[PDB]
């Protein structure tokens, strides 16, 4: 179809960081949207959906407060600001292993040549072992 | 690879004029802004400015405002530091950084060392 | 202008130790911060952002943490290149200020 669409993924072989991957089944870049320095490139004025999901995991609490935070950040292309659109909190702990996914949605409006990044405090505290566990997305509406 | 490579730097007389050039490659020039920081010999950090590299407008620190002065040539991905009336006090290393409008400097030049000196 | 003020100046502490410096903010800054690892005569390398976010490719062992004016770098365990010297900043409000700076030396 002919809207700006992008739904891409964390990459399974990245060393234990947040690579964000459409070379991929189910996965998708189209549309003049493109993946700039592990950012999506909005190639158009208009509203878009942007979305992403993390799934955090441990194996047990270390004997520090965790604060895990997971965040969308615009770049917008003229003013060069990287500002926060979609964040969310999740704190772990107070033998056995744990899992905290954080789900961050919502509608703006992005200038053509805007960027998007999905990013996360704590590579170390990432599960991407199986699939459709970590993703970014947009489509434009 | 990200690089910002430095020079210009180097021995000047006091009351002097020098240009810095930070060169940089591996990235899209224009999507992020560039920041200018100088580091006295063997002290800390001090912020001198940033310059938006899409739209050309600087930010100056209030010591250095006007004496030195920041621009581009976009073209060829390097951005530039013009230094005018240097004193011996003015002797550092030199530093661009990367970054966002008020925000981190994730890549940093080599850093190039101007002296000033008679 | 906002004053960031690093402590210790400088430490020593034997390899696989936990390191902790803390920085101190005359304003409150809320998370916009940041912290630099120099090694001597070297570039500054960007550690972490946003007072807890880490950097691609920089080791786990390094963990910021704090918001409001109290913020602190530390070091899981110790390793021997680790010796530097760290930076946090502040970039809430311009211009940018560094923390004086804080020496790591290793103790064997």
């Known amino acids: 179809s002919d809207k700006p669409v992008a739904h891409v993924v964390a990459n399974p072989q990245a060393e234990g960081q947040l690579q964000w991957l459409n070379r991929r089944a189910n996965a998708l870049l189209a549309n003049g949207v493109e993946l700039r320095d592990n950012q999506l490139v909005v190639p158009s004025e208009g509203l878009y959906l942007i979305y992403s999901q993390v799934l955090f995991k441990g194996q047990g609490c270390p004997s520090t407060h965790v604060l895990l935070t997971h965040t969308i950040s615009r770049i917008a292309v003229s003013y060069q600001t990287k500002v926060n659109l979609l964040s969310a909190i999740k704190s772990p702990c107070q033998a056995k292993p744990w899992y905290e996914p954080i789900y961050l949605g919502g509608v703006f409006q992005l200038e053509k040549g805007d960027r998007l990044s999905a990013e996360i405090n704590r590579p170390d505290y990432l599960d991407f072992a199986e699939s459709g566990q970590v993703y970014f997305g947009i489509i434009a509406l | 690879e990200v690089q910002l490579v430095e020079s210009g730097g180097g021995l000047v007389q006091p009351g002097g004029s020098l240009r810095l050039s930070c060169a940089a490659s591996?990235?899209?020039?224009?999507?992020?802004?560039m920041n200018w920081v100088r580091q006295a010999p063997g002290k800390g950090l001090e912020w001198m400015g940033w310059?938006?590299?899409?739209?050309?407008?600087?930010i100056y620190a209030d010591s250095v405002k006007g004496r030195f002065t920041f621009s581009l040539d976009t073209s060829k991905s390097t951005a530039y530091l013009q230094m005018n009336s240097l004193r011996a006090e003015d002797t550092a290393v030199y530093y661009c950084?990367?970054?966002?409008?008020?925000?981190?400097?994730?890549?940093w030049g080599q850093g190039t060392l101007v002296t000033v000196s008679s | 202008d906002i004053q960031m003020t690093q402590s210790p100046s400088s430490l020593s502490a034997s390899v696989g130790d936990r390191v902790t410096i803390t920085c101190k903010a005359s304003?409150?800054?809320?998370?916009?911060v940041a912290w630099y690892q120099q090694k001597p005569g070297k570039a500054p390398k960007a550690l972490i952002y946003?007072?807890?976010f880490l950097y691609s490719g920089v080791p786990y062992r390094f963990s910021g943490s704090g918001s409001g004016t109290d913020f602190t770098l530390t070091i899981s365990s110790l390793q021997p290149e680790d010796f530097a010297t760290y930076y946090c900043?502040?970039?809430?409000?311009?211009?940018?200020?560094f923390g004086q700076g804080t020496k790591v030396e290793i103790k064997r």
């Open positions: 950084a990367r970054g966002y409008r008020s925000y981190a400097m994730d890549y």
């Open positions: 591996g990235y899209v020039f224009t999507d992020y802004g």
């Open positions: 310059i938006n590299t899409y739209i050309g407008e600087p």
């Open positions: 304003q409150n800054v809320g998370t916009n």
């Open positions: 946003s007072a807890s």
């Open positions: 900043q502040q970039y809430n409000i311009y211009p940018l200020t």
